[PDB]
Amino acid sequence: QVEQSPSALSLHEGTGSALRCNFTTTMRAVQWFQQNSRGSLINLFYLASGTKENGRLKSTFNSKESYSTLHIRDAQLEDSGTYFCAALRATNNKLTFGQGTVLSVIPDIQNPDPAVYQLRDSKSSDKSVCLFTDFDSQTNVSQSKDSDVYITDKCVLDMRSMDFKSNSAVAWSNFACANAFNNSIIPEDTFFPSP
């Protein structure tokens, strides 16, 4: 079988790290995958020996030494996902998977502008949601403590043409935006439009 490490990983955008897989029996080959949010296993590498490169990824495999590494450099949001190594036994065409590395890339917010806005339904004016947006990645969004209040985790979107990234979280219920996110710790300077 296999021992993959780390189990979980947080990289700031632009930084790098290495995943490792030790094999506790002798393997003849290894494959590395990235599983995206869609659940798609995307092939990164296949190796029977040596070292290969593939963009910002590097991979090494040594059968005698019984390990493989996967190096990520200059981490991009797109790198987020769960990485697996999988090996073929030397003496069985079935792959044995490592436990996985869950990789989170922390987006670099260039110009934080924390705010909470209220948005109305296109169809019905009375329905509305609250959008907390433009805070830097240091901020965390806490779930609601009230059962009639819904608060999503934070999500980073990337407007590529403008080279602009922004975090946001959504809250709604069946109330006031001014206190929708109160159980979270939000920047002191957070803009609360005066509607």
Binding site: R28, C155, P193
Partner: protein, 240 residues
């Protein structure tokens, strides 16, 4: 390398039959089936070369029938569906050449019955004026609510084309009623555009949710509309 698997999601009640198909790119005669659970453990199920099985899980653990007929898609089928079957069924293929290429898989969920299955309701919320004048940008928010199970795929469409830039969708739906293991779900997504783009009333925005529910085969004996696989959408036009 371009493996096909259908359906992308499957929901079944206990004791029902669960069938999924795989179609390897031609040139690949070797087909593998793997099961991935929610703790990310993979379990090899079976291996085919041509129409012949090479390897297989332990016989006393085998819960499925499977075959790769000539000129037909590989199928894998569970006859008496049970909760413990709920998982991501992955199909892979290879050509000698040892590399395995995976399909997008079939996400199977098994419930006591199909009575709590509900399609999503979908709504689009328009950017606030305050955000526009403060940031020169405009975020639209889509809410998909009251669906069960969480078998959905949300996409955004701008003037008839699918967009990915400026979009972010929750990784995890939330439970409308966390106390109930039977709770319905909600999901949010944002699409952000420049103020000028939003303010051009010639621009059209649609939030589309593909829901995976019951098929013609499932028996619906209930007062409400059979919650079949369907698309639900909500839209908005740009606004000066």
């Amino acid at each position: 390398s371009k493996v096909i698997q259908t359906p992308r999601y499957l929901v079944k009640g206990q004791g029902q039959k669960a069938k999924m198909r795989c179609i390897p790119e031609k040139g690949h005669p070797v087909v593998f089936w793997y099961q991935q659970n929610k703790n990310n453990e993979f379990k090899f199920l079976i291996n085919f070369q041509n129409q012949e099985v090479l390897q297989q899980i332990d016989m006393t653990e085998k819960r499925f029938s499977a075959e790769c007929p000539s000129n037909s898609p590989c199928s894998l089928e569970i006859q008496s569906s049970e909760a413990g079957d709920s998982a991501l069924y992955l199909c892979a293929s290879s050509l000698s050449q040892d590399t395995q290429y995976f399909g997008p898989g079939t996400r199977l969920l098994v419930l006591e019955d199909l009575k709590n299955v509900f399609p999503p309701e979908v709504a689009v919320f328009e950017p606030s004026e305050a955000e526009i004048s403060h940031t020169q940008k405009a975020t639209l928010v889509c809410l998909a609510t009251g669906f069960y199970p969480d078998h959905v795929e949300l996409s955004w469409w701008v003037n008839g084309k699918e967009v990915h830039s400026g979009v972010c969708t929750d990784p995890q739906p939330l439970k409308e009623q966390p106390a109930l293991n039977d709770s319905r779900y909600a999901l949010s997504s944002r699409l952000r555009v420049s103020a000028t783009f939003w303010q051009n009333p010639r621009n059209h925005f649609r939030c589309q949710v593909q829901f995976y529910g019951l098929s013609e085969n499932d028996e619906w004996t209930q007062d409400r509309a059979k919650p079949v696989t369907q698309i639900v959408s909500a839209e908005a036009w740009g606004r000066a």
